[PDB]
């Protein structure tokens with residue numbers, strides 16, 4: 446049912462640094478996630494140029510932002526390439542070890558945390574605002590899986606039998622008790638307009 450894994454040492458250190466460094470400009474977390482979805486949508490666009498059946502699991506390429514105050518979650522959904530179980534386990538398809546290294550030597554030279562994305566590990570910036578992150582993902586070549594972590598050095602992967610999603614990735618942010626501003630419609634608009642106004646994909650902000 447549920448497998449448990451240790452983060453490689455550098456990733457676990459990255460997540461600690463993200464969770465523990467005083468840094469007030471937390472909103473960039475949404476820029477990085479959106480920008481991740483956009484890269485995944487780019488990849489399935491690319492693959493489908495030569496093989497049109499790739500989009501058999503879904504023609505529409507979009508990004509949805511779904512705030513829920515009940516569950517205190519914000520979900521970024523896309524219909525991108527998604528991840529196989531192997532990639533989920535390998536730091537969600539990133540190069541987090543050397544990315545973390547570059548990022549940490551960039552810090553020691555006057556970078557700041559908002560630059561995390563230039564190093565290919567922007568995903569982890571989810572931990573600027575989430576105490577727990579769940580990733581539901583489905584790639585054409587594999588089953589639908591759920592990855593989950595509350596940091597602390599370990600993460601779980603399980604097969605997800607919940608809502609078949611067809612193809613893409615859902616990032617569910619269980620928000621820190623004091624970062625509920627990111628569930629406000631107005632606040633999400635302001636951030637999407639400021640940081641992601643030019644993203645080549647329709648971004649729908651769901652209402653509650």
Ligand SMILES: COCCOc1cc(C)nc(N)n1
Nearest residue numbers: 481482484485527537538614
């Ligand atoms: C960006 O390409 C990676 C494959 O799928 C992924 C990976 C990550 C970290 N986020 C999303 N949204 N999709």
Ligand SMILES: [Mg+2]
Nearest residue numbers: 507508509649
């Ligand atoms: Mg839609």
